Design a protein around this ligand. Sequence first.
Ligand code: MG
Ligand code: MG
Ligand code: ZN
Lengths: 681, 95, 621, 37, 238, 231
Amino acid sequence: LSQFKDETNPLSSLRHKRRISALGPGGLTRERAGFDVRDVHRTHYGRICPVETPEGANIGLITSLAAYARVDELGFIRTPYRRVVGGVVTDEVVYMTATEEDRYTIAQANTPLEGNRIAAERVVARRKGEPVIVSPEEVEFMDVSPKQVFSVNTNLIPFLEHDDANRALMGSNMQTQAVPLIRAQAPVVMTGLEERVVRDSLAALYAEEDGEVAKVDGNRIVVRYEDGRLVEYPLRRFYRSNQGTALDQRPRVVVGQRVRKGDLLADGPASENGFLALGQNVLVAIMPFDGYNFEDAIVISEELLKRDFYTSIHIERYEIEARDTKLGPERITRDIPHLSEAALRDLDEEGVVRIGAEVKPGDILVGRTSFKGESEPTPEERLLRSIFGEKARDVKDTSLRVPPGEGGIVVRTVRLRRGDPGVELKPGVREVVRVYVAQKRKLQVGDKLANRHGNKGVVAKILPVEDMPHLPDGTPVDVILNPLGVPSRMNLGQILETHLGLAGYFLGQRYISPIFDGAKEPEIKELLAQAFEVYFGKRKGEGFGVDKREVEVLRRAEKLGLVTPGKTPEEQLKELFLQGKVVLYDGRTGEPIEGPIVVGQMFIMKLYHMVEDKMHARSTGPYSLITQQPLGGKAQFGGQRFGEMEVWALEAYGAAHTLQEMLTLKSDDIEGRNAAYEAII
Amino acid sequence: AEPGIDKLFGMVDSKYRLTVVVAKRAQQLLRHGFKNTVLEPEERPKMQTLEGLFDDPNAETWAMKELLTGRLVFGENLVPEDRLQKEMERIYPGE
Amino acid sequence: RVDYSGRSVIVVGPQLKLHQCGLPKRMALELFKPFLLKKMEEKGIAPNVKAARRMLERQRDIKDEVWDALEEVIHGKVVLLNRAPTLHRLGIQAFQPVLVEGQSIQLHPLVCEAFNADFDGDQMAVHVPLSSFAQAEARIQMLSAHNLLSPASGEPLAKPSRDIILGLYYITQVRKEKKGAGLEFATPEEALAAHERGEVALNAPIKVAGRETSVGRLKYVFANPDEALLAVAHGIVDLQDVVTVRYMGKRLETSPGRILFARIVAEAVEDEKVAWELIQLDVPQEKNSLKDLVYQAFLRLGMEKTARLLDALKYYGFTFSTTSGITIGIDDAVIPEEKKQYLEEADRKLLQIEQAYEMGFLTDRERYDQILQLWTETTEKVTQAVFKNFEENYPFNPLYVMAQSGARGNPQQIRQLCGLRGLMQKPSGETFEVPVRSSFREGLTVLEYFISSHGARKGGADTALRTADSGYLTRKLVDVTHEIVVREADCGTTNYISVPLFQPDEVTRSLRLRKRADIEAGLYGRVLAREVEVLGVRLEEGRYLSMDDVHLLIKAAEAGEIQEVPVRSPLTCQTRYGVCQKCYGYDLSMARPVSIGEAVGIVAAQSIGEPGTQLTMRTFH
Amino acid sequence: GRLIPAGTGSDFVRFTQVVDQKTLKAIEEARKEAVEA
Amino acid sequence: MLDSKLKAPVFTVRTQGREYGEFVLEPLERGFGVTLGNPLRRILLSSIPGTAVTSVYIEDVLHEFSTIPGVKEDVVEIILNLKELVVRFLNPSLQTVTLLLKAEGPKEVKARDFLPVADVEIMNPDLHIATLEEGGRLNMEVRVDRGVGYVPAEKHGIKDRINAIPVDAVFSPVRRVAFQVEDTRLGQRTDLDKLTLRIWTDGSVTPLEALNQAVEILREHLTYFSNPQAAAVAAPEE
Amino acid sequence: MLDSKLKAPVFTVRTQGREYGEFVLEPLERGFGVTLGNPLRRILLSSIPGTAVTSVYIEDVLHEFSTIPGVKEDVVEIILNLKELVVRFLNPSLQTVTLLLKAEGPKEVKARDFLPVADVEIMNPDLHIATLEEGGRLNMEVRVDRGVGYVPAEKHGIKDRINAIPVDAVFSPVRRVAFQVEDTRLGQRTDLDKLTLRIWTDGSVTPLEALNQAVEILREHLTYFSNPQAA
Ligand SMILES: [Mg+2]
Ligand SMILES: [Mg+2]
Ligand SMILES: [Zn+2]
């Protein structure tokens, strides 16, 4: 029940603290009570999120506490309902348990109000779980807000009501895995929560009283409060989360700035002005692209890379122990025995790598020498040495090296010694050394991107801007999402997000569109109309008519019955823009794409990359002492697991030798694997 | 696909015999340099690198080319088991 | 655990030919290290192996020539790719690697279906066949391009998939224009006259003095294919317009589209003649028709030449979808005008139900039952309307197009986007008598949304109750069948089974022709046990039943001329712990007789097991 | 640890031999040393 | 390196007869396959000068959708057979020629049977036009014209003889063009383009010739960015 | 009299800044608007050589992830800012320069604060670089190189000073490129093309200059088609 705090980003932690397990000292996985327990109960309404849950074999066992829900002293989850008396609705709110609730006829929140008065003839209500239509006389309580039904994470999904649940689960989960970018943006279309989350997550640093800013540098902020108090705020800087992602507060405030109580001072890792910023807003055209977006895969304009758009900073920690031995002590030292000097360059510092060095895989982080092999040199090596001015030293190179698959650049080394400072070291250890290595991970093929509507994919292609589909005004797009990822998923929320986002892109505005409340088709279409004026309205003023290609497209467009026949070229184009579709030019050919394409701004997150899911390759390495099977080293990968399932596939192929060599030469058979190597060499 | 897979299949009575024949011909086609080859100069497999088409090193291939020319013979119980591992060392040095 | 192996995230490789895959060089360099080290010694880039190995320990010390030495080591050689869980034989396939920059394995799109891989971050493991022998197996029997048909059903498996269909469908479609109705006149130019002053449509279903026509057909009359296509390129006609073309001496009425498709096949199979008689020219290409095109190609031309066609279809399919201009805007989830009514008529029929209950003619359950009965009928009548609407009015609509082409989506899903979600079921199993009236376009109510999440779980849970492991079944099956291999060529047994072509008990004990699939599944690739003379043609004993042979029998049974077929089966085979080649029959994955030595029990276990994972589990209705 | 009894491991297939036309002068080695003097 | 600049790419050609050629140009820097490929393709299909039949007189048929007695084919089919006739002007001055042909009875008719006129020579002399048998006869005034691309019959006006039926005129002698750009390597560079370009001609022009003069039309068009003419920039008006 | 072709088109420019340009070419043969506009826009967006910041050395920093005292910005933020710096090499034989900038005390450092170098103009002297509070001192050398396209820092070993920080280079001075193709006539000839390029740049290079170079590149590419080879 105690676990490694998930702090990939602020929300990860918030969500982690709000979790609810059925496992531990209560009945778990063995018993699995399938389809029971794992199951959203009528009473979960407003107490537990019906969507936020782990996909996979923990489904419905671990679970998330709903936004407004509260746990009382007896340990029961309660939910706020406002008391309604005779069709008028009081602001007097009550926190009912599950059993108290069952005594009542509770109306839904969208129920039309005319002031405090219930305006509607018939009212939707739940009577102990039962959806019913009732007249307003019969109503005893009302929901506070759609917000209450869902977890925090889910509440962050705009247009949620348009997404099937299975995919909104994936949405509210992936947000957890969103890595903090260095140019993070809060979404164009928000729900509400995004500000208040950062507040509670303790991500960003706020001012506790009215005052004026005294000092500000990347390192600390000092504030003179109206009483005279000068309080200093150390700005936690470039620090390492459990997950290796960085957290660092940056100052968002200038010297001599007047500041109200509760005003912002520093942004967290994943906030943009105190609004949760978990990703970028980015232009997306939804259309297939030559197969590069084939099966959830995503294409990417190199332009993103240049704008440092999906760039995150990651810090890895390395440790090395200097241990006492039965053979005698070993030491951290610059003086290792070998055939190199250019292999010591950025070390000098008495064993340890210099703070600021670029370290590649295989390079020396910390130099270390152990007394080795029960201290016998080979009679065969004894000679070899005396031919070269023998030393035949007792101590071995056990130096710490940057493992394959990369390191980066050194930022802090930390040294702890022989108990004496205030340190309890593992028994047998003389001292440890830590080296911390930072890397600006740019976006690249393989990286996985996600929107909040559970559309998730892997960057399969990076095209040069010239190849990118562009609007007529010469603006190219950033990502190309495939439409086939929508019909079967029934996550229509992203399409709406895009439409509003398109209007936003031209009107230079962002939106708050509450869950089960928010923007609605006609309101978006009105904004798209305004936007059209910017996107097109000016073209005539700057001296341009409609493109011959624009005409070509409309001809085809009216046969699809998107546009009205007879209406002018321009007014057809508006009609099309109201459906959130534009005319797109193919940057390869210059010709247009037959029929209009939906483009617009979408919020997308780059997702945390786990070491287990990093790229792996073994040739030949260590082996297990007892079983003599390939085993993973420090800077040497273990082998892949070959299971009976894979053994059947091979059998069904009749690939007899392959199966054999898989389970002998390439594993178990001892001399087999040596003779094999020697042979190949 | 491989150049001639359909017809390679047509040459045998069991899918698996092909593979066997091929492997074994590759084993000997390696064991004796590439001296055994029943492939006339101009029809030898080729590569491209360092810019100069040297012979294709892949013997798994070689065997498949030779089969398709039909200059080879395969059978269940042809020649005795050791009147072969020495008789092949006569025409082409084992070195 | 295993010695020459690696794992990585996969990314699609649209550029790859079917037998290739993209391997990051960094990963290739480790997997082939020992081999690499030797080439290094054979080239003036290392004295000996120790010094070569030392060259490779640190990334900065790695030279250029080294990567050229890799492309040479790799030559010919193939690797294996595996995506877990390996549910059947195709869970492992062999490709020859192509070294790529970056750190992702690049996977050909046609092999995704079998791997059941998709690109939301699946990883594949890579393995390296070391020996001369293991390489031959890998290359001859595991190479992707040699496994185009399924060993379970013998239907193609590497077949056009998604965007690929979409592309190809869009070009082989033809527009249906309505602003010309069904007028007639003194045709010649008086027809086109109308068209000129905007009166008739061009693909309008005119039926002039004599015959039915476009406009259209009499306007655009091309002497050869490339004249037609020079035209479309000149923007004076679309691939979808119906037109007149003289092809192969025949004077045709199709779209330039359909010609272009016909060409694609012809060129890919190096055979203009056979091409034209594999193709279904008078329908839009879709999941199924293409499937059948591949299968035929496979039987008629090689498997080698089939893979060429496969990549050809891939290539165009892909490029044609890009310019096609299919997307999804909110306005594409088209709600049929009919929905108002069906719901208003439902709602009033519901009054009547509630009345007859409040009187006391209805038992609690009788009412409840009757309500569900109703909402069911209605959900149907709506789904019906949605599609009818799309077909009449917006037949090129992206949602419609995707669903029909088989590219993606089913009617249940389309109904949920445009019609209504319909009835959801309670956690307890029973159904809510109030259905979800909203479509995902309209956007559900918070109550509608909660209500409907109950089934959401049951879903997720019952998937992840087999998507962890239902290879539970396949285990059980291997354990009983693993010893069975095609051992003899013929066990020489006389007896057999008799596959029926009729189902009893319809009108209790009445006979009824079995379904075509159900028969194909019983008959294809079986050896005939006794002669069967049917429809004036004698099918001989010992004959392997080809697919056409089966349709013949079906044809003969429809003509009431046969009722069962005597068929040599493994049920009656007399091979000791094994099965003879005659009693097994066709390979299935290759459409020929099984080769002696096939591990046919394992193939049976996987075939039965693999689908098990997608068998909606506990009894729910 | 044994070669499986199926595919390239089945007995029906396992023991196949391959020889070139020129190495088929091994059967002439029997044909040139059978009768002595 | 970065690198320095770039190699001047090799240009290869294989040429099967006078009717087809493949053109490979490698290596090109990232993107340049498409940058070259497309312009040249549209030039090749729209703007290379050629000839073809534009309208036809026939002695004994009024409508274009009629059939004629004693000649086993449609009127339309004969028109179709003409749309495939390829001729070449060996004189630069010639703009329009009306070719003569006349024959009847139990004989087959090739292209060659056209009466030899001016500096005009038929490329495909064995082109099948029509078969005839008994009584039925054929006399016509087949009118050729120098042009570009594809001009339909309804798209060009001012009609000829009192019996003139316009013909869709495939002027362009390039029957088809197709190109694919594929990745290629040079040292550490995996990012470079290699441009393969396949061209079919009717054989009045070499495939390689068509290309030669395709590039030209682009080359010459680039010299139009030459004589800069000033103009006022538009007011912002906001 | 040979009406087969048509008179050489009028090429008319409409150019004011160093930053924006419109370029017109009418009448062209039908289609030719694209045949020309596209390849040019590709060559423009991709292949025009520019200048850009390549490495930054700062007085008392060791690496990119440090933070200067008395300075609001992180070192990462400052580089991001330095990426926005646009500079002209008035001399075309100049491949690279190092700009110096020492600053001190309460002030807001912008790009004009850089020590001036002969034959090198800073196109955006107002661009914000850092804010310095009391006693905060910023002292830096900024390397500017001439180049083409996109060249990321991991792709250069810029080892002039061992404490320099290599920066990603975005050389292209062309910032955005649209083209219009509109209906135009010449007497009885109806569907002719009127091509109109629109080129935005950073100021270090001009729209017209960029356009000329882009043409010259394409011109020099159609060169490679003559001088064949057998297969
Ligand atoms: Mg997946
Ligand atoms: Mg016509
Ligand atoms: Zn049997």
